[PDB]
Amino acid sequence: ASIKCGSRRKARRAHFQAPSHVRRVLMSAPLSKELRAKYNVRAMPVRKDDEVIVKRGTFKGREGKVTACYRLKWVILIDKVNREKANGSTVAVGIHPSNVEITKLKLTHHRKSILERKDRS
Amino acid sequence: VSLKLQARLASSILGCGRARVWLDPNEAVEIQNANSRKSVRKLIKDGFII
Amino acid sequence: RLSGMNHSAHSWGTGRAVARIPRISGGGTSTSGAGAFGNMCRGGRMFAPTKIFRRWHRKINLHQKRFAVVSALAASSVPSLVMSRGHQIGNVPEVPLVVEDSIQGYEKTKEAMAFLKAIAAIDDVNRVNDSREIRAGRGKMRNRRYVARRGPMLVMPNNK
Amino acid sequence: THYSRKPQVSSKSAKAKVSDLRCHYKNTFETANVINGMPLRKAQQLYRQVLAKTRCIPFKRYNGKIGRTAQAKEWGQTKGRWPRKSVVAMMSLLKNAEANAIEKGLDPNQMVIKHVQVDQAARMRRRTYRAHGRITPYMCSPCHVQLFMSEK
Amino acid sequence: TKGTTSMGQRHGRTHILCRRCGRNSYHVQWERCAACAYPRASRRRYNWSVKAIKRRRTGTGRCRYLKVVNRRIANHFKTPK
RNA sequence: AAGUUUGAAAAGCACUUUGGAAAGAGAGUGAAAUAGAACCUGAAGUCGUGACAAAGACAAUGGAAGUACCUCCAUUUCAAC
RNA sequence: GAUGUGGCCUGGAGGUUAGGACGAAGCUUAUGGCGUGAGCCUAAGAUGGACCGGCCUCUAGUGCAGAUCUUGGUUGGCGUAGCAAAGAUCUAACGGAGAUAUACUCAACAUGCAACGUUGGAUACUGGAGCGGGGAAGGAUUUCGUGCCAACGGCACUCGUA
RNA sequence: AACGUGUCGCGAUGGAUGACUUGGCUUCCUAUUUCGUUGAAGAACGCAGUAAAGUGCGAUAAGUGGUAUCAAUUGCAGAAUCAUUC
Ligand SMILES: NC[C@@H]1O[C@H](O[C@H]2[C@@H](O)[C@H](O[C@@H]3[C@@H](O)[C@H](N)C[C@H](N)[C@H]3O[C@H]3O[C@H](CO)[C@@H](O)[C@H](O)[C@H]3N)O[C@@H]2CO)[C@H](N)[C@@H](O)[C@@H]1O
Ligand SMILES: [K+]
Ligand SMILES: [K+]
Ligand SMILES: [K+]
Ligand SMILES: [K+]
Ligand SMILES: [K+]
Ligand SMILES: [K+]
Ligand SMILES: [K+]
Ligand SMILES: [K+]
Ligand SMILES: [Mg+2]
Ligand SMILES: [Mg+2]
Ligand SMILES: [Mg+2]
Ligand SMILES: [Mg+2]
Ligand SMILES: [Mg+2]
Ligand SMILES: [Mg+2]
Ligand SMILES: [Mg+2]
Ligand SMILES: [Mg+2]
Ligand SMILES: [Mg+2]
Ligand SMILES: [Mg+2]
Ligand SMILES: [Mg+2]
Ligand SMILES: [Mg+2]
Ligand SMILES: [Mg+2]
Ligand SMILES: [Mg+2]
Ligand SMILES: [Mg+2]
Ligand SMILES: [Mg+2]
Ligand SMILES: [Mg+2]
Ligand SMILES: [Mg+2]
Ligand SMILES: [Mg+2]
Ligand SMILES: [Mg+2]
Ligand SMILES: [Mg+2]
Ligand SMILES: [Mg+2]
Ligand SMILES: [Mg+2]
Ligand SMILES: [Mg+2]
Ligand SMILES: [Mg+2]
Ligand SMILES: [Mg+2]
Ligand SMILES: [Mg+2]
Ligand SMILES: [Mg+2]
Ligand SMILES: [Mg+2]
Ligand SMILES: [Mg+2]
Ligand code: NA
Ligand code: NA
Ligand code: NA
Ligand SMILES: [Zn+2]
């Protein structure tokens, strides 16, 4: 949302005080090479029920379905990306969306409108 | 176990001072169980508080 | 102008066994009775506070400016001076380096890079690229985060 | 408050410590130091005899203008006291150390104290009121105590 | 004597809460606030204490209506067609 | 007055054992726990501890020369060199 | 007191040349080397975890031992002075982690002390101008019950206007 | 002897230093840019399923409506719809 500018202070303040609707755009992930060719779009904002593969970090290579876009902790929650607590409970591990690649898009009418308007052809 | 509440309630009910209120050294459990003026009056009737 | 002096501070005098420095009035707070108004005092006014009417700019004689530009141009035609300044001009054909005017018709950066490689200015260009780094010190917290060397200067006959 | 020294044999040693004890540092310092080289049972017996006031704790460092007693002669001193608050705290620490030795499978009857360190913990602040409307500090000096013992 | 003993002679209040400003500066006997000069129509404001002025100035409170009217002015009093 | 500035992520220490509790001793998480919680780095001053050096009373410190003992320091040398 | 110093050092800028996850800054030293010196450099960290060095020029809120200097912390004095007006408490039982708490020897004393809340007794005090019962001013939940002992009630608490 | 002294290793106390900076300070610019008896600024009291402060709001009370946006908010809980608008 035109966050970058000549002032590092102003840019960082705008990023970390960005509203939720701006945080959605900031938390975008690249489309897979298959989806990129089909839609002619480079990246999309992640939303719940999208299928992603982790490309960077400890969980690299793990596939799963997005279960939450927390947007307050700048992380997305993936069902297959989790770990164990001390008491044996299973807790999801947050991942920054720019570290994953979207393999399948949860399609909605407005989602299709965004894909159509971002079509570069 | 503290019987301060029962001693205070007995003093008010009997209309006398704490020195005049006698709380049976035995039956402290029964006296401790009285938490209302109705229960304290029963203790007075039974002779546990004189 | 008001920084460090916006207090109703007065000295206690010499009767009390404390230094004769103005001190914050009142009570009930940590700053009550603390030293004030001093360049040595925490929360006090700095020595010789900076002013905006400092002489920031400078006049330079017009002929001296022209002399300096002329001298800089003459030094640019000496390959030993250019190399001493740090440029990689080992493969360039001639100094001064004069190229044809057709480069003004370039529309793609790819063509411009091809021209730079052909006339062997890419060595200086790569020198700048490899020198890009985060600036050391506080300047990176300011708006001067990235530093790099100076590469070649391409001089055009006009703004096109 | 980590241990400043390591036992010679870890599997034959037991460790115990307490932080911010809320006992006087100086009194606890004297109380704990006297058992540094003693067997665990002898240290426990001495503490019981200190509580019985038949034996005393020698005050070697923090003894400025304290009273004199004959019970300090066995330690080579003339000034000693009976700091019951420090003593009962130290006996609790010895019980924890003995429990650790028992848990590791060692025999408490053969455990010899090898390390005793008392440190000045963070101070707690209170105030006292003085003449001419002066307020003046009224400080509490807690201590850190750490020890370990090894099988002999 | 003056001092500690005389401190116990201080009974009652000179000032109570002010209806206009709520600063406990309303002189009971003179029926006027030492802080805001209520019930005089205008408030106290003195340039020898700019700090006092800026404590009480506009923007130190909610600006309940000023926020609304400033938005309307910025939008040129826009209204539906 | 006061930066909650732990960590990449709470994964914020399950469970065992001693203790009335606080906590201790184990065990775990983590690359790191001497990163354990208003927790990055952790100085100075002061203090505790183990080892060692000794030392009468010249208040102590200091200067210049040696010597005794020590030295996770440096450098040189090891064959007709 | 003057002046000089291809004299030393600090933050930032314009240039140039380098370093850093195989460890930057900072910090530590019986780590040595170099310099008459300001200081510089290496070594080690069983320190640290992301920046940063040299050289030319520019620039400034640029070098501390002490101003009864400022702020923060510490510290000997020191377990010291003391915690002494308002007389005074004792006893048993119950309650409580607050015990009757023990290597060997050994019957119990000489090896778990001290201090408590409640009830019943005992002794005494206040002595109606009251450590009696109600109000104003002032305070504003301190009132009541249950739970609770970290901090606070300058000793203590299992008690409390906590 | 013991106190005490000195050194080294390891700990405690104590939060300097470095790195970090959504803050301050200072200098420029843009304009259908200047409150109120049509009750302002300021003050007070309230409003959340859970809510002390702060923020937002005013018994329509952490908000109603409209437009745009296009799958959340998030400590827990609750929740028709999983969505052309409703
Ligand atoms: N050894 C004598 C003293 O050493 C002191 O300095 C010592 C310490 O400051 C310094 O720091 C040591 C470090 O060396 C050693 N390798 C690791 C240790 N963690 C550090 O110690 C530090 O951390 C620990 C806890 O981690 C703290 O307990 C301790 O107070 C702190 N100084 O090691 C130094 C020893 O060489 C003083 N400079 C000085 O008063 C005196 O010379
Ligand atoms: K002065
Ligand atoms: K000050
Ligand atoms: K009026
Ligand atoms: K003023
Ligand atoms: K001097
Ligand atoms: K002292
Ligand atoms: K009442
Ligand atoms: K207390
Ligand atoms: Mg200032
Ligand atoms: Mg730096
Ligand atoms: Mg005396
Ligand atoms: Mg004495
Ligand atoms: Mg006093
Ligand atoms: Mg007074
Ligand atoms: Mg007077
Ligand atoms: Mg009067
Ligand atoms: Mg009057
Ligand atoms: Mg009147
Ligand atoms: Mg560390
Ligand atoms: Mg010797
Ligand atoms: Mg010598
Ligand atoms: Mg500066
Ligand atoms: Mg040293
Ligand atoms: Mg200065
Ligand atoms: Mg200094
Ligand atoms: Mg005394
Ligand atoms: Mg006395
Ligand atoms: Mg007396
Ligand atoms: Mg006295
Ligand atoms: Mg016994
Ligand atoms: Mg007993
Ligand atoms: Mg009498
Ligand atoms: Mg009376
Ligand atoms: Mg009460
Ligand atoms: Mg007390
Ligand atoms: Mg609230
Ligand atoms: Mg209404
Ligand atoms: Mg919608
Ligand atoms: Na990324
Ligand atoms: Na230190
Ligand atoms: Na030491
Ligand atoms: Zn007023």
Short mmCIF file of C-alpha atoms (C1' of nucleotides) and ligand atoms in Angstrom, two decimals, chain D residues 128-131, chain G residues 154, ligand 14:
data_model
loop_
_atom_site.label_atom_id
_atom_site.label_comp_id
_atom_site.label_asym_id
_atom_site.label_seq_id
_atom_site.Cartn_x
_atom_site.Cartn_y
_atom_site.Cartn_z
CA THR D 128 11.88 4.44 59.48
CA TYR D 129 10.84 7.82 60.88
CA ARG D 130 13.43 10.00 62.61
CA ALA D 131 13.55 13.22 64.60
"C1'" G G 154 9.81 -0.96 62.34
MG MG I 14 11.29 7.31 64.93
#
